[PDB]
Amino acid sequence: PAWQARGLGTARLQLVEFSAFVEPPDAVDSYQRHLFVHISQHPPLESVDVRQIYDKFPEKKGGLRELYDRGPPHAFFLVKFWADLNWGGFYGVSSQYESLEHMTLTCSSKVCSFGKQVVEKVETERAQLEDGRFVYRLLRSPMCEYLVNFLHKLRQLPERYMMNSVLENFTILQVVTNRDTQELLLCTAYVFEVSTSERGAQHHIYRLVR
């Protein structure tokens, strides 16, 4: 019917902002950051069948199929990114979410290659009540050396189509849960392409359904 999402969020937990970036060693003297990917959230979304992408994510325990069976279904999103790979500095990742309620969150980010987990970062964040809403800040988390090395390698490939072949097998799953209750709040699958040089980062957000 309606009650379908218009952005990457639920009624309990909206994404405010996400970005992955690099600030070069000279940012100290004149500031600059490069954004590989970026979502800012300050008509319903299109949907994609989750069965179609199981094989791109880990299986057995905390993999897509069992997370979807566990549910709740309305918390599952797919982000397609066109990443801007055109730039020993600082590689970071910043997320911010908002809720009506006070929770401690667990945020897990699982990097996967050919559908199999390679690295995983798990952080927790207690709420900070601000003007009405609660807010959850995970700003400037350092990027896993895995990704940093991946990026440098990807950057050097001589053809966009090779970058996209390589990225065809590279995925990220973000799972955010209420650390106290264990309830799942947001689950986001990321699939990746490279954008062209002078087009910067873009994205498109889908609901995951079945």
Ligand X SMILES: CC(=O)CCc1c[nH]c2ccc(OCc3ccccc3)cc12
CA angle 138, 107, 167 (to 5 degrees): 95
Q: Which is nearer to ligand X, 36 or 206 (CB)?
A: 36
CB of residue 168 to ligand X, shortest distance in Å: 12
Q: Which is nearer to ligand X, 131 or 159 (CB)?
A: 159
CB of residue 29 to ligand X, shortest distance in Å: 26
Q: Which is nearer to ligand X, 93 or 205 (CB)?
A: 93
Tokens found for residue 176:
């955010």
Q: Which of helix, strand or coil describes residue 208?
A: strand
Inter-CA distances, 130 with 101, 127, 137, 178, 179, Å: 11, 9, 12, 19, 21
Task: Give me the residues that bind ligand X (CB under 6 A), please.
Answer: 20, 36-37, 83, 93, 109, 121, 141, 143-144, 147, 151, 172, 174, 190, 192
The residue type at 120:
E
CB of residue 205 to ligand X, shortest distance in Å: 13
Whether 187 contacts 175, CB under 8 Å: yes
Pairing mode, if any, of strands 90-99 and 46-49? unpaired
Q: What is the chain's Cα-based Rg? A: 17
Tokens found for residue 133:
């809403």
- Which helix (DSSP H) or strand (DSSP E) does residue 46 occupy? strand 46-49
Q: Which is nearer to ligand X, 101 or 145 (CB)?
A: 145
Q: Which of helix, strand or coil describes residue 150?
A: helix
Q: Which is nearer to ligand X, 47 or 141 (CB)?
A: 141
Q: Which is nearer to ligand X, 109 or 177 (CB)?
A: 109
Phi/psi for 135 (5° steps) reads -140, 145
